Structure formats: C-alpha cells, structure tokens
Amino acid sequence: DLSAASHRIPLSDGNSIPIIGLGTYSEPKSTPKGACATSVKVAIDTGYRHIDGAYIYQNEHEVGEAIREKIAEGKVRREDIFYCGKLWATNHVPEMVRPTLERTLRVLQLDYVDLYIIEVPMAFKPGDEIYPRDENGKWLYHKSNLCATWEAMEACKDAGLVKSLGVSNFNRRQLELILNKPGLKHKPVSNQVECHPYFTQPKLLKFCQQHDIVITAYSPLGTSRNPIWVNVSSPPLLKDALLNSLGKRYNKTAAQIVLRFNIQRGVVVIPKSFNLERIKENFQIFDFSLTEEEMKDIEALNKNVRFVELLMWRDHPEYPFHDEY
Ligand SMILES: NC(=O)c1ccc[n+]([C@@H]2O[C@H](COP(=O)([O-])OP(=O)(O)OC[C@H]3O[C@@H](n4cnc5c(N)ncnc54)[C@H](OP(=O)(O)O)[C@@H]3O)[C@@H](O)[C@H]2O)c1
Ligand SMILES: C[C@]12C=CC(=O)C=C1CC[C@@H]1[C@@H]2C(=O)C[C@@]2(C)[C@H]1CC[C@]2(O)/C(O)=C/O
C-alpha cells in the first residue's frame, strides 16, 4: 500500500498529507546554525515530502531556505512539498492571526503553507515575548476564545494563504467547540498531539476518526528527553524490550518499529532528526509491515503517561491534559 514514492493520505478538505514528515524543533542554544536547513535538504533527497515546523522554533527561515533550494534545483515542485506551520499562544487575538501567518510566509518566502494549526489551545499575553511572565515569574495568560481565533484562521484559507487548517494539543472538548461552532466554514483536518507506544491516544484517535480528523503524532520517538521540559518518569521509549525485540525480527531499529506502528494505523509521524544517518533510517519504514498481533502488543505498551506534560501551564483555563482525552 504505502510506499516510499507514494505515502500521502487524504484530508477531509480534499487535500492530502505525507504520512511521514521531518520534525524541525531543536534546542536553539545547543543547535548549530544551518543544521535545520541541511537536514531538511537531506530529508527531501531521502524521500521526505512533509516538513513540520514553527516560527517559534526560531529556524523557520532555515526551513524555507532548504525547501526553496530543492524547488529551485528541480528536485521537487512546490505542490510536491507539504509544510506545516503553527500559530503560537501569543498570537491568538483574532486580528493577529493573519499577520502572524503572513510573517511565516515571509520568513519561509513562500506564497502559502500546506497546513497551519493552532499550536496550543491556550492564549498567552500578546507581545514580542513568546513566554510572558511578570517580575515574579508568574505566567501572563490571556483569555482564550477558540471559536473567534478559528474564524480568523478560516479567513486565511479563504484568502488562499493556506491549503488546510488544523489544531495541536486540543482535547475532545476543545475540538467539539470548533466542530459544533455555529456556521462553521472549515473543519479542522488535523490535530497534532504527542503519540507513540507509551501514549497511544486510543480514545482521542477514535474521536478524531469519527470526524475524519487526521492525527499527527509529534514526539513519535519519545522526544529528546530534555529534562528542562520533558517528563522522564518513563524510561527511554527506544530502549523498550518489546520494540527492540520486534526490531530484531525485521532487522529494523526500535525507532523504525515505532514509526511503522503509527503510520500503519493511519497516524502521521513527524520524527525529528538533524543526523544524516538517522534521517535516512527513519524513512525506511515502507519495506515491511507489522502483523496484527504485533500491532496489538505494541499498542498494549501504552502507559497513559505523557513525555510532554507542560505542567507549568496546568492552571491555564485551556490546559488540555486535565481531561481523559
Ligand atoms: N505541536 C506541539 O505541541 C509539538 C511538541 C513537540 C514537538 N513537535 C513537533 O514534533 C517533532 C518531533 O518531536 P520531538 O522533536 O519532540 O521528538 P522525537 O521526534 O520523538 O525525537 C527526537 C529525538 O530523537 C533523536 N532521534 C531521531 N531519530 C532517531 C533514531 N532513529 N534513533 C535514535 N534517536 C533518534 C533525535 O536526535 P538527532 O536529531 O540527533 O537524530 C532527537 O533527540 C518536533 O521536532 C516538532 O516538529 C510539536
Ligand atoms: C512544547 C513546545 C510548544 C509547542 C511546540 O510546537 C514545540 C514545543 C517544543 C519546546 C517547548 C515548547 C514549550 O511549550 C515551551 C518550552 C517547554 C519548550 C522547551 C523549553 C521551553 O521553551 C520552556 O521551558 C519555556 O517555557
């Protein structure tokens, strides 16, 4: 079915999305300049046709640099590349949405993005600081109004600035809000959330499928496990006994096993790697398939524990991780 040359799955709005993509977040201070650009280029050469990024990653300009060069050389046409950008918490004010998208378009130097999503359901105080906090370190929040923000996102698609609209880190309630919104124009086609063998998102996935919403699994390899923000209570996902055991069976790494797992269930994966060898390794997941029994055993690894909890914002009205899903 899915192959290296053809692995795009349909979105509810008529568009399609490559089931595998390259994630581009990397610790700014511990990441060499140009690393993201080089990686995106290698990814496209390897076969990737989906790049997931965000203005707040502070490297969106490198992403554009790489994409434009590949188009310029004729490696791919703009329509062959799928780029996803995100609207940060400090840009949820309706009037700020379009200008925020336009900024990203100017940074990437492209006419449009394939997918633009609300980064988090929580709104933070607008400004030049992506992490608002007063003198006491108290997080400066802002009253959220998802419906209004969405209408602003819908306007962007009406203007032809983005092909598809979606969300990220949205729970069932927040999704319903948009889905049941009076006079809804464009339903969200995707919800990007943490998803892997240790957090399979069983209920959220079923809900999203009822509405034809595709789930993009971020941190599909269990994250970089940076203690500064990652909950390390759970052991290294890639060190899992079963995942590695199944890997020996197909002569694949645990990383490849976990990526095959999600894409085989229709979940898009956006593994991040700025390493030449690992970028290639993560794409080699079309030359084999997991048996149903194996698929069920891997799913059974679910621990219901998030690597990305974002506890520092558990008090924000829109914190999405309080509910079961
Ligand atoms: N929307 C949201 O709220 C949200 C949140 C977090 C992340 N994301 C997106 O999701 C992407 C993926 O998640 P993530 O970066 O957190 O995590 P991840 O993709 O789960 O894991 C990345 C870590 O794994 C390493 N790695 C990559 N391939 C490997 C392989 N084959 N074997 C062993 N280690 C490997 C990477 O190091 P090397 O680079 O050295 O290979 C890096 O430290 C992000 O980069 C971003 O585009 C979205
Ligand atoms: C999840 C998150 C927000 C949405 C997104 O697309 C990607 C990321 C990955 C990096 C996270 C970021 C945050 O939410 C803020 C964090 C957690 C940052 C790493 C350190 C950080 O910048 C911090 O500690 C300041 O608050």
Spatial distance between the Cα atoms of 18 and 266, rounded to a whole number of angstroms? 11
Q: Ligand 2: which of 25, 229, 318 to mutate, judged by most atoms within 8 Å of the beta carbon?
A: 229
Compute the 3-state secondary structure of the chain and give helix, strand, coil in percent, each to the nearest 5. Answer: 40, 15, 45
Ligand 1 contacts CB of residue 222 (under 6 A):
yes
Kindly state the DSSP code that residue 56 receives in the 8-state scheme: G
CA atoms of 185 and 200, how far apart (whole Å): 30
CA of 30 to the centre of ligand 1 (A): 14
Contact 60, 51 (CB under 8 A): no
Radius of gyration of the chain (CA): 19
Q: Check pocket membership of 57 for ligand 1, CB cut-off 6 A.
A: no
119 near 56, Cβ under 8 Å?
A: yes
Tokens of 243: 């995942």
> Using an 8 Å Cβ cutoff, are 182 and 128 in contact?
no
Q: What residues does 237 pair with on adjacent strands?
A: none
What's the angle, vertex CA 121, arms to CA 119 and CA 127, rounded to 5? 70
- The angstrom resolution of this structure is 1.9
Q: Is 89 in the pocket of ligand 2 (CB under 6 A)?
A: no
Q: Is 229 in the pocket of ligand 2 (CB under 6 A)?
A: yes
Centre of ligand 1 to C-alpha 322, Å, is 24
Q: Is 228 in the pocket of ligand 2 (CB under 6 A)?
A: yes
Tokens coding 301 = 């690894």
What is the rounded distance in angstroms from the CA atom of residue 49 to the CA atom of residue 180? 33
Ligand nearest to the CA of 257: 1
CB 62 within 8 A of CB 26: no
Phi, psi (rounded to 5 degrees) for 9: -110, 150
CA count, 13 A, side-chain hemisphere, 86: 27
CB 305 within 8 A of CB 219: no
Report d(CA 271, CA 259) in Å as an integer.
8
**What's at 304, amino acid-wise?**
N
Report the SS3 class of residue 17.
Answer: strand
Which structural technique was applied? X-ray
Q: What residues have CB less than 8 Å from 125, skipping those under 6 apart?
A: 90, 132, 140, 141, 142
Residue 128 CB neighbour total at 10 angstroms: 5
What distance lies between CA 19 and its chain's CA centroid?
12
3 state SS of 10: strand
Distance between CA atoms of residues 165 and 153, nearest Å: 7
Catalytic residues: 57
CB atoms within 10 A of CB 14: 9
Contact 259, 220 (CB under 8 A): yes
- Give φ, ψ of 56 to 5 degrees: -65, -10
What spacing in Å lies between the alpha carbon of 27 and ligand 2's midpoint? Answer: 10
**Strands (E) located in 212-324:** 214-218, 268-269
Q: Indicate the length of the chain as a whole number.
A: 325
Q: What b-and-e string marks burial along 71-95, b requiring 16 or more CB atoms within 10 Å of the CB?
A: beeeeeeeeebbbbbbbbbbbbbee
Q: Which helix (H) or strand (E) holds 9?
A: strand 8-10
Q: Which residues contact 255 (CB under 8 A, 6 or more apart)?
A: 221, 238, 271, 278, 281, 282
CA distances from 321 to 20, 173, 284, 305 (A): 25, 11, 33, 11
Q: How far is the CA of 189 from the centre of ligand 1 (A)?
A: 23
Q: Which of 3.30.200.20, 3.30.2010.10, 3.20.20.80, 3.20.20.100 would CATH assign to domain 1-325?
A: 3.20.20.100
Handedness of CA 39, 45, 47, 48 (dihedral sign): positive
Rounded to whole angstroms, the Cα distance separating 205 from 201 reads: 6
CA gap 323, 261 in Å, rounded: 25
Q: Kind and range of the H or E element at 209?
A: helix 202-210
Nearest CA to ligand 2 atom 16: 229
| Nearest atom, ligand 2, residue 312 CA | 26
CA nearest neighbour of 84 among 55, 62, 58, 106 = 55
Query: What is the number of the ligand closest to the CA of 56?
Result: 2
* DSSP, res 197: T
Domain range list for the chain: 1-325
